[PDB]
């Protein structure tokens, strides 16, 4: 048995999930003289891979009941009775053998929307559970603890009156919830006395639950390759941060820039201001509840091109503990009819379930597309990607880290619907670097390079007044190209 | 047999796939008393012509085990659900002859994305492989290897915790990596005293392997 310690420290979603299944099944006296009975069948959403099947085993051991487990997609067969009579056995065998708890999972492909199929074998099977769930009228004895991710694939016919009108969300184990899942995975394996569990849970912040058992198991393989009573040393977990690879972020495999807060930025006042508003709601939630002000979600960048508006976007990718999902501008816009409105929804939905997370939407000129005076520029009303992003924005953002980084060169092409104070509240502009800030641009490039002894340096920044921050990269490349050209001429 | 000498280059990647197949098979007691054994699956993605089918030939001849091979879409047939059972029959033959090594090929159509696909056979083989993978928990097992392209066409239910969690990319050799390739392919041939293999891979810069 798995007991109660299989999910520990996550009592913010573990003590309230016992109010829905255990406390109705403990005694039927609290539902008398109260009127209606809410918890008939509950629906659980959230990040997949946290223990959605372990909690189905946890309710069977702590509460004495008859548990009938269903793996899910194993019933799919072309036999009239193998996929129709076995689901009737899951509702009738538990009724006579009280209590009647039942569990099903992976209902992503099972019961899709009605536009996909019509009158097939798969549509005939999923209509039987609509009346079998409504057929069980036992008072506080049957409950559906069905655990299914990806909520846009479930058809809304199952949430009409009382089948799945109880919505529960499994939160991220952030406040001391990630410490106990590492506690139960080291009591059975060998560990050396040189690691700290609080430091291990504080370096990385992007967790999906299933990766938590994967980062600790990767350190066990590191001890094998060096050694050719064992334990896991300190540097085996230090190798694990270079390949974190959570289950949700399996599409962003781009190269991360090496930034140590000194190779980017000539200004420090505007750099610190965006650091302060992005590090407050991710670290501790007690400051925003005391002040009462709503947190700003997303920031807009505008100004001259080549000033450092996407170079700073690589600086927010590794040093900030929130995750980084990048898009290459208008690449998230498909050719077909409904595929264009889905690709801008699948990226935002796959990130918000596990979201210490910033996102970098590049090239907002291609997204806002100057909707004022459209005249059918996209053909048959295919320019509906501007208001579909308005549906994803300001949708379930109560303590949800969604920081859209918009780097744009022309601010006048963006429609003012996103510029409204209910969506974006911080408007920052990166100005021209002066003579006191151009010295930090050249010091960022002359940091990790072999260089000559000190020539004149302040006279270089005083003569380039009138050009942007990317123009000094041209003068540092021509000085570096002329150091390689004469080196081959020095040879022989 | 091809061995390991026929796979030239990519030495940073060869240590990853050897420690997950040979080391559970050579020393099964080494994985004891240190917890559960990590490596249960690997996805070999990237460009197609990088040497990704000979890696299955390399693990089928160097170590002494049974090699049952699964091609691409070949399990489809006109019956009352044979595709969900013939794929299941490939895993129950591996359970009978444990330990062994299985190899499934061309994961571009057998396991597509569930939302993009359409049909009733293609959407049930993507469901059948999800149940028999995590349910199979045998020690010293045949743990699956797959060689295909387009890693973005893989469903995220195949990469969660224990089905494919140690995926690797076969990198394209740009510096001193194609030199090891030409030392192997011309080892069988008798070259004259005119070629210079230090200058062959130096003047070209773009190839796949």
């Amino acid at each position: 048995e798995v007991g109660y310690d299989d999910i520990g420290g996550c009592r913010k979603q573990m003590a309230q999930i016992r109010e829905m299944v255990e406390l109705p099944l403990r005694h039927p006296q609290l539902f008398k003289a109260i009127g209606i009975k809410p918890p008939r069948g509950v629906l659980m959403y959230g990040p997949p891979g946290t223990g959605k099947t372990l909690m189905a085993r946890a309710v069977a051991n702590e509460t004495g009941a008859f548990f009938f487990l269903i793996n899910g997609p194993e019933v799919m067969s072309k036999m009239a009775g193998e996929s129709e009579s076995n689901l009737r056995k899951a509702f009738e065998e538990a009724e006579k053998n009280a209590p009647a708890i039942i569990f099903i999972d992976e209902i992503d492909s099972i019961a899709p929307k009605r536009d996909k199929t019509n009158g097939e074998v798969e549509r005939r099977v999923v209509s039987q559970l609509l009346t079998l769930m409504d057929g069980m009228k036992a008072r506080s004895n049957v409950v559906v603890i069905a655990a299914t991710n990806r909520p846009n694939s479930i058809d809304p016919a199952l949430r009409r009156f009382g089948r799945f009108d109880r919505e529960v969300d499994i939160g991220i184990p952030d406040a001391t919830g990630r410490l106990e899942v590492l506690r139960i995975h080291t009591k059975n394996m060998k560990l050396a006395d040189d690691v700290d569990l609080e430091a291990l849970a504080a370096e990385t912040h992007g967790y999906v639950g299933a990766d938590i058992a994967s980062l600790c198991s990767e350190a066990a393989m590191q001890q094998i390759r060096e050694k050719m009573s064992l334990g896991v040393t300190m540097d085996n977990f230090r190798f694990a941060l270079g390949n974190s690879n959570p289950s949700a972020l399996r599409e962003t495999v781009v190269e991360s820039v090496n930034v140590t807060w000194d190779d980017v930025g000539g200004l420090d006042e505007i750099k610190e201001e965006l650091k302060e508003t992005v590090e407050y709601p991710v670290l501790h939630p007690d400051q925003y509840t005391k002040f009462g002000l709503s947190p700003s979600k997303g920031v807009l960048f505008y100004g001259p091109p080549g000033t450092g508006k996407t170079l700073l976007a690589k600086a927010v990718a590794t040093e900030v503990s929130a995750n980084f999902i990048s898009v290459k501008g208008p690449e998230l816009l498909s050719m077909w009819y409904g595929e264009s409105e889905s690709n801008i929804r699948d990226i935002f939905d796959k990130a918000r379930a596990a979201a210490p997370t910033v996102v970098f939407l590049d090239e907002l000129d291609s997204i806002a597309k100057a909707r004022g005076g459209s005249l059918g520029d996209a053909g048959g009303a295919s320019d509906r990607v501007v208001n579909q992003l308005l549906t994803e924005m300001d949708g379930m953002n109560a303590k949800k880290n969604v920081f859209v980084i918009g780097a744009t060169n022309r601010p006048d092409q963006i429609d003012p619907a996103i510029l409204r104070p209910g969506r974006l509240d911080q408007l920052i502009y990166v100005p021209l670097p002066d003579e006191n800030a151009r010295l930090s641009i050249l010091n960022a490039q002359l940091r990790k390079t072999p260089l000559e002894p000190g020539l004149e340096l302040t006279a270089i920044a005083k003569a380039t007044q009138g050009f942007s921050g990317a123009d000094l990269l041209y003068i540092v490349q021509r000085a570096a190209k002329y150091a390689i050209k004469d080196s081959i001429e020095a040879h022989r | 047999e091809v061995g390991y000498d026929d796979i030239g280059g990519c030495r940073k990647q060869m240590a990853q796939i050897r420690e997950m197949v040979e080391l559970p098979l050579r020393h099964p007691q080494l994985f004891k008393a240190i917890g559960i054994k990590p490596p249960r699956g690997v996805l070999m993605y990237g460009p197609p012509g990088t040497g990704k089918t000979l890696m299955a030939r390399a693990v089928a001849n160097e170590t002494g085990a049974f090699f049952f091979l699964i091609n691409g879409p070949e399990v489809m047939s006109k019956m009352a659900g044979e595709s969900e059972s013939n794929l299941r029959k490939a895993f129950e033959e591996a359970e009978k002859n444990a330990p062994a090594i299985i190899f499934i090929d061309e994961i571009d159509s057998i396991a597509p994305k569930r939302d993009k696909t359409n049909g009733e056979v293609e959407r049930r083989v993507v469901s059948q492989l999800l149940t028999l993978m995590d349910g199979m928990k045998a020690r010293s097992n045949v743990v699956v290897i797959a060689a295909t392209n387009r890693p973005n066409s893989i469903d995220p239910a195949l990469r969660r915790f224990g089905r494919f969690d140690r995926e690797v990319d076969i990198g394209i050799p740009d510096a001193t990596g194609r030199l090891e390739v030409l030392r192997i392919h011309t080892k069988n041939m008798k070259l004259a005293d005119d070629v210079d293999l230090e200058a062959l891979a130096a003047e070209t810069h773009g190839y796949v392997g």
Partner: peptide, 24 residues
């Protein structure tokens, strides 16, 4: 003044074709 230079076809989901698996 402004003339539209494109119709911009963005739709069309084609045909389908089924695979009838025999029963016995």
């Amino acid at each position: 003044a402004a003339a539209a230079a494109a119709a911009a076809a963005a739709a069309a989901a084609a045909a389908a074709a089924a695979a009838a698996a025999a029963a016995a």
